[PDB]
Structure formats: C-alpha cells, structure tokens
Enzyme design. Structure first.
Site, PDB file in Angstrom:
ATOM      1  CD  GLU A 116      95.701  25.498  48.003  1.00 36.39           C
ATOM      2  OE1 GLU A 116      96.459  24.802  47.296  1.00 36.39           O
ATOM      3  OE2 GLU A 116      95.894  26.715  48.211  1.00 36.39           O
ATOM      4  CG  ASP A 117      96.460  25.721  53.830  1.00 33.47           C
ATOM      5  OD1 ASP A 117      97.479  25.470  54.506  1.00 33.47           O
ATOM      6  OD2 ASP A 117      96.379  26.698  53.058  1.00 33.47           O
ATOM      7  CB  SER A 118      92.324  19.822  53.505  1.00 34.22           C
ATOM      8  OG  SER A 118      92.971  19.070  52.498  1.00 34.22           O
TER       9      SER A 118
END
Ligand SMILES: [Mg+2]
Ligand SMILES: [Zn+2]
Ligand SMILES: [Zn+2]
Ligand SMILES: [Zn+2]
Lengths: 56, 266, 56, 45, 115, 86, 69, 147
Positions: H3-5
């Site tokens: 999730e975009d990390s």
C-alpha cells in the site's frame, strides 16, 4: 460549528501511519514518545497499589 | 577434517573466490551473514572539531571520517570502550588520529586520509593506520580547501560491528550462488518464448554437468557446493574475513552452549 | 471520516520509531494508504468511556 | 568585549555594547560572530 | 525521535538473559526457547541442524517482529529424549563442522600465491 | 406514579441490548475501581472491566435498567433477569 | 557535494578513485565506461556512484572564505 | 512495502544515502517603543529579569547570542533579549524591587535541535540592531519520510 459541534480536544495524538503485517487486526502501534505524553488516570485500588507504586 | 570442503578458484588481496562443498545451505548463509555484519573492525567513531573554515559541515566531515577504512589486523587486542574501565577512552580500547590541513597554496589543496596521524600509543599493535589502496599513495579524498581555509580536528577510533553501523563492516559485496543449472528447481524461470535462450548461463555452469536431457527430476537432492566470492574493503585481509567469520559464528554457537549450561546449574 | 468505521477502537502496542502502525486489512475501512497519510489517536479518560470504547 | 568578523573584508573586530555595528576598516554594516573556541564533539555516524 | 540504539540488537540488557526455556503445553515433550539479541543467523542454522536429528519430531523458529532482536525456537523430541539435549547436540555439531571448515580453508589458502 | 409500567405488562424486549451491556460493564467497572464490594469470587483478576464481566456472566450486578419510552413512561429491568445472548 | 567515501549499496570504497577517474577521462581520452572498468568498478551499483556524482564542492570553493586566518 | 510503502536499506542509509542538511534561521530586532522604552540584546539574570523561560541561558554570551559552532537543543535560548517594565504591576507575587527587566528572549523550536551555524549582527533601515541566527541539523531517513 467551530467551537461547540466540534472543538479541539486534549489527550490526542497525530502522526504518519505505517503498515505492519505483524500486528493483530485490532492492534495499533503507538510511538514510544507519544505513549509518554498521553496518560490515563487510573484509580488506586488494592489490586493495583503495587503496580502503580512502581510506575510512580 | 572430513566435513565442509574448500576449493579456492581465485585468490587476491581484495577478493577470494572459492567453492564451499559438503555443507548445508543454512551454514553457508550464516557464514555470509556473519561476514557482513559481525566481524569486529576499527573505525573512527567520535570527532572533535577545533577549527572548520571549509565549505563543508562538521557533521558532513565527521560522517566521511567514520567511513574511512582503518587497519584492523590486531583488532582483537583492542577492547570495547563499553567494556573498559576508563572515563572516556584510553589506549586499551581506542586509537586517536589527528587531522591538520591548511590552505597554504593558491590552487585547491586536497585533504586525503594519508594526512591522518596517529597520536596514541599503539603498544606494538597493527591497528589504526588508514588503508592506502591506490597508485598515487593518497587515500580517500576527505575534503578540498582554498587558500586561507583550515581544518583542525581530532578523531577517536573504536572497535565495533556493522550491526551497530555499516562503517564497521570489513566486507563489500559477497557473491553467493548454488545450483547454476536449476536442478533442484528452486527457481521457476520467467520467459517469453524459451527460458533457456532468454536467461544467460552462469559462469559456474562450467563446474557442474548439465542436466541429462530427459532424466526424471531428482527429488532427493539437497543444495550444496556453494560458489562464494568475498570482497574486502582493506581493513583486514580477505582471507581473514572468511577465517574470522567462521570464528565469530563458532563463538556465537558456543555462547548459546554456555548459556544453556549456566541455566542447568540453577 | 465519512462513516463510523473511520473511527474504530484499537489496543495499544507501544513501539519504536515515529509512525503509527496498523494491520493491512483495516486500511479499506479507513480509506488509508501509506504514501504520507496521518491519523488521529484519542485516549479515553474514564472506566465508563474505556469500556464503552472497547465494547462498541 | 566580543570578537566579530566583517562580511566583506574578513577583518576581525572587537565590539562592546556601546560600539556601533559596523566595520571600522571598510565600513560594512554586517558582521559575523566568530566561531566559539571550545571544542565540539561529533559522532562519525 | 524514537530510534532505538543500534547496540540493542546484540548487546544483552540488564535483567535480561540470553535464553528463556519454557515448556509447551500444546504437545508432549515440547519446549519453546526464546533467544534474546539474536536474529535469523542463529535461528536458521540451529533449526536446520536440529532437523537432521532423527529423535526430533518438530523444529521451527520465528522472528515475531523485525523491530526486536529476538526469535523463538520450538523443539519437540521423541519420548525419553530431552529437547535441551537435542539443542546441545545440534550446537556441538555446528561447532565441530565450523572447526573443520576453518581448518580446510586455512590449509587451502596457504597453497595460493597471488595473496 | 403513572409513568412506571407494572412488571406484569412490560412490553420491551427481555434481552439486554449492546448499549445496555456496554454501560452496565462500564458502570460496574467504575464502581469496582472505586473500591466497591465485589459479589463474585475472583480466581485472580485486577482489571475492573474483567471483574465486571465475571459478575455479568454469573449475574451478580445489583443494578436495574430504566428503559424509557418516547412518551416519558419507563420500565424497570433487573440486570439479573435480562438475557445476555448477544 | 564531494565524492562519497563508500558505495551506498555494497560499501566498496570509491572515494579514492575520483581523481583517477577524471585523469583517465582527460589525459587518456578514455570513454567513461572503459575508465570505470579500468578503475575496478564492476558492479553497476559502484559504477553509478562515480558516474552520476556531481562535484559541487568545486563550485562552493569559488566563494571567498568567510573567515581567513 | 504494501500500500505505497517502501523498504530502505539501513546499510545504505548508514553510508549516506538520501541524507540531507536542514537550516533554520531566527530573526530578532531591538525595538524602540517611542522615546522612553527600549530593548537590548542581553543575557538576563534570574534576579533582575521577570518571566524568564524555563530553558537554559548558559550558552548565551554578554551580547545575548550563542557563538557559532555550539550545539543547541529544545527550549534553549539562542537570542537573549530584555525590555524594561512599568512599576505598580505585580503578577503571582514574585515581583520585588530587585526586578526591573522582563525576558523577551527567543528560544529554539521545541522539537528541533542542532548546532548554531552562523550569527550575523547588523542594522535595519531604521538603524535598530537586529540579528540572524542559523542552526544546522542533519536529517537521516527513517520510517516516516516520503520518497
Ligand atoms: Mg495518501
Ligand atoms: Zn579504555
Ligand atoms: Zn570590513
Ligand atoms: Zn557497489
């Protein structure tokens, strides 16, 4: 609207969120510095006198 | 002696290339993990700045000074400052280097790591000296000065491991490979038309026979015969990196054995 | 916070670093990702609200 | 008194609380406080 | 700032022991050992060596959170065989194997010339 | 007292609601924290909320819930007689 | 601003090769790829360390010193 | 990295990957409130100055400025200043004949720290003394930084 229906409150914290695959669904990871600022007033009873004394 | 086997293919002062045979994959992986993260090494840890009129910051220069590789051949005769009985640091757990550079010339003057001078009592040891590994005899380009600029600082070098900070790592990239022909099927090769034509053959494919082209999959085979290449930054000899990695791993297992014994008595 | 699942009660887990940490499966109810989002934490101050929070 | 440095001619001055903030040599009106002469410690990480 | 000091990875703290052995009630003759200030390096090596023992029925390790340098080791042996003894035997096997490896590398290195 | 419905014609649910359980547990937990006499046997427990849960499970909470109706009338239900099924 | 001491990815020392790299480019008229390999930088992690470095300290040294001794 | 990390190499960070300098400047002037009341840059004492901040004044010099190269932290006073007060005003007691000044100092930001990099003293268009103090700090990537 700005002061009665909603207002700024004490005992709150804000920071960036991260994803932890190793936390339970209902768990939240709290930074240690935040945990030292936020407090909970716990009443002294016979069941917590010793634990509270050590914390003090 | 009839345990893990070793065959050295190429040896140098910076690289050692060998084949590790008759070993488990867990042991081989632990050897490279220890060689990367747990071999004690001497590095500059604290810097006192007396004069800094350069175009760089003190924290900028301190980080560079900590990354300069120092000699660590006799590092075991040094102590950990945390385990030493001294206020700040002494000759039993530290090495002191001074750096004095002035812009005396009109052209740009370069401050190298060869300009670091040991002002401690080495007590006959072989640690502290910056590693010079180039042709001109200079070391790492620490800083550049113009006329009238001065850099005066004192460096204190302590022993540590790359787990604490990567500056204490004695090893650069470590090559590690097994089963170049994929006979254990630990990789499922991505391809478009033909995987054999699309994936270049490993150089280690010449040390193993190719698959017999039609024999059944061998499900009883386990990974062994690892091809390893260890690179050294120069703080310690590359052969010592392998030897001391085994020593560090051996000590760690012994510590577990000792801790288990200590619990038995109580 | 457009719906009631955007405010939910979690169990504290004090942790190193300076970010909040949460399970991946609770990111859809919050409509949250980890590109820089921030979230707010509120601490109940009494046994009433403390049981109310964990039981509702 | 405390020591300052001119920002254009790099002349080291010594000013008191009564002296005007200006270089007595070239006349610049910006002075840089000299670096402290007590040692400062830095971690090499 | 909330960055833990990097020496917490390997330096064992005060009132904290390297090993913590507790019996496992989910199965007979099973125990769980908690290793402090260790990581996958020892867990993988010790667990793999345990799995070569014929008197070991189960061997697995896990690092519950990468933030903290500790891993758990679950061992179950056959009846009459103590899991602590199984760990002892495996550790001895690793030490002897490593000792042989060091000698073999040193004798092979002394035969080279370039360095 | 015309607004107190006699027990024989109470028409409300015989089940505890989630909000009733939440307040009863919080109400009794707060009382326990203030050194209230516990009417259940403790086999080892220090959290007031857990003690309250033990009391609710064994039906030893001496409270009644006054359920209000939109016309001002109310019904009194004992925590002991209310079914905790949710 | 100045050449990094170590390669970020693997930690090989590359801060003692900047002047050698520049000299190879200037006097030997070598292409940058050949110079990188002549210096012993084989892994592309190390090649981009020297290949993409911008020497800003040379620009900073054009300003007169704030404090002359 | 869900999730975009992202996962960053701590070893690369240790070697200097994506490390940056941060500079912050603090401005302060010696205001003249007409013809009578005037301020000065000073190191106030606890015996003559009221409303002094709970921080530490140990790093100031006689001119009310920290010399460049000194390390500072939260609540530290980097520009010391005082202004005179009018009598017949007592707050929380604590206001005796000894007190004739009140603290008007500038403290470092509570969450920030670093080393004082530069201090310049000059005069504004109106001839009043005003100073600029710059503080250096290094930011090293951690688990909340955006890339
Ligand atoms: Mg977002
Ligand atoms: Zn010592
Ligand atoms: Zn001047
Ligand atoms: Zn590299």
């Amino acid at each position: 609207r700005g002061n009665l229906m909603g207002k700024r409150v004490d005992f709150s914290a804000r920071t960036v969120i991260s994803g932890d695959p190793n936390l339970e669904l209902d768990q939240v990871g709290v930074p240690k510095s935040i945990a030292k600022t936020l407090t909970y007033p716990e009443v002294v009873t016979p069941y917590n006198i010793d634990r509270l004394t050590q914390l003090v | 002696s009839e345990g893990p086997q070793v065959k050295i293919r190429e040896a140098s002062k910076d690289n050692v290339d060998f084949i590790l045979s008759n070993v488990d994959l867990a042991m081989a992986n632990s050897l490279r993990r220890v060689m990367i993260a747990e071999i004690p090494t001497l590095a500059i840890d604290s810097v006192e700045v007396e004069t800094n009129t350069t175009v760089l910051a003190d924290e900028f220069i301190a980080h560079r000074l900590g990354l300069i590789p120092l000699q660590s051949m006799d590092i075991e005769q040094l102590e950990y400052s945390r385990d030493c009985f001294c206020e700040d640091h002494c000759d039993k757990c530290s090495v002191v280097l001074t750096l004095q550079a002035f812009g005396e010339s009109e052209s740009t003057t370069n401050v190298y790591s060869k300009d670091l001078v040991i002002v401690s009592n080495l007590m006959g040891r072989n640690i502290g000296h910056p590693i010079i590994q180039d042709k001109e005899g200079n070391g790492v380009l620490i800083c550049k000065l113009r006329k009238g600029q001065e850099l005066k600082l004192t460096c204190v070098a302590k022993k540590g491991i790359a787990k604490e900070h990567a500056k204490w790592g004695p090893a650069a990239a470590i090559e590690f490979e097994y089963d170049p022909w994929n006979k254990l099927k630990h990789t499922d090769y991505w391809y478009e038309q033909d995987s054999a034509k699309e994936w270049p053959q490993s150089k280690n494919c010449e040390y193993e026979d190719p698959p017999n082209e039609g024999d059944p999959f061998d499900y009883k085979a386990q990974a062994d015969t690892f091809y390893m290449n260890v690179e050294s930054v120069g703080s310690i000899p590359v052969d010592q990196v392998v030897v001391r990695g085994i020593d560090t791993l051996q000590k760690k297992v012994a510590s577990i054995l000792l801790a288990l014994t200590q619990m038995d008595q109580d | 916070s457009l719906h009631k699942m955007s405010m939910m009660a979690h169990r504290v887990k004090v942790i190193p670093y300076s970010t909040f940490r949460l399970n991946l499966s609770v990111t859809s109810p919050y409509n949250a990702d980890f590109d820089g989002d921030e979230m707010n934490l509120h601490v109940p101050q009494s046994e009433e609200t403390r049981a109310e929070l964990s039981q509702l | 008194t405390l020591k300052y440095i001119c920002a254009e001619c790099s002349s080291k001055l010594s000013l008191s609380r009564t002296d005007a903030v200006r270089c007595k040599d070239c006349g610049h009106r910006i002075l840089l406080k000299a670096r402290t002469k007590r040692l400062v410690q830095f971690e090499a990480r | 700032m909330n960055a833990p000091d990097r020496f917490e990875l390997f330096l064992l703290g005060e009132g904290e022991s390297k090993l913590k052995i507790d019996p496992d009630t989910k199965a007979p003759n099973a125990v769980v050992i908690t290793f402090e200030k260790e990581d996958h390096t020892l867990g993988n090596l010790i667990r793999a060596e345990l799995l070569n023992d014929r008197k070991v029925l189960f061997a697995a390790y896990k690092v519950e959170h990468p933030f903290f340098a500790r891993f758990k080791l679950r061992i179950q042996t056959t009846e009459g065989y103590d899991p602590k003894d199984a760990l002892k035997n495996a550790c001895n096997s690793i030490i002897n194997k490593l000792g042989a490896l060091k000698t073999n590398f040193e004798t092979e290195w002394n035969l080279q010339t370039l360095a | 007292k015309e607004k107190a419905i006699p027990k024989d014609q109470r028409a409300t649910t015989p089940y505890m609601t989630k909000y009733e359980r939440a307040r009863i547990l919080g109400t009794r937990a707060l009382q326990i924290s203030m050194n209230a006499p516990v009417f259940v046997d403790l086999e080892g427990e220090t959290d007031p909320l857990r003690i309250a849960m033990k009391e609710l499970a064994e039906k030893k909470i001496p409270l009644v819930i006054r359920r209000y109706l939109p016309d001002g009338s109310f019904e009194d239900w004992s925590v002991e007689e209310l079914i905790v099924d949710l | 601003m100045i050449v990094p001491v170590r390669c970020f990815s693997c930690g090989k020392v590359v801060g003692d090769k900047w002047e050698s790299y520049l000299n190879l480019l200037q006097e030997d008229e070598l292409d940058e790829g050949t110079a990188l390999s002549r210096l012993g930088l084989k892994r592309y992690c190390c090649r981009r360390m020297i290949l993409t470095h911008v020497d800003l300290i040379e620009k900073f040294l054009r300003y007169n010193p704030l404090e002359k001794r | 990295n869900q999730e975009d990390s992202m996962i960053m190499n701590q070893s690369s960070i240790d070697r200097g990957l994506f490390r940056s300098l941060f500079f912050r400047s603090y401005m302060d002037q010696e205001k003249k409130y007409g013809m009578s009341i005037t301020e000065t840059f000073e190191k106030p004492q606890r015996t003559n100055t009221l409303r002094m901040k709970h921080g530490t004044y140990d790093k100031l010099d006689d001119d009310g400025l920290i010399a460049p190269g000194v390390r500072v932290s939260g609540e530290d006073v980097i520009i010391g200043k005082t202004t005179p007060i009018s009598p017949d005003e007592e707050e929380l007691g604590q206001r005796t004949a000894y007190h004739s000044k009140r603290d008007a100092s500038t403290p470092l930001r509570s969450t920030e720290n670093g080393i004082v990099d530069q201090v310049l003293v000059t005069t504004n268009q109106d001839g009043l003394k005003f100073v600029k103090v710059r503080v250096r700090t290094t930011k090293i990537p951690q688990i909340g930084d955006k890339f």
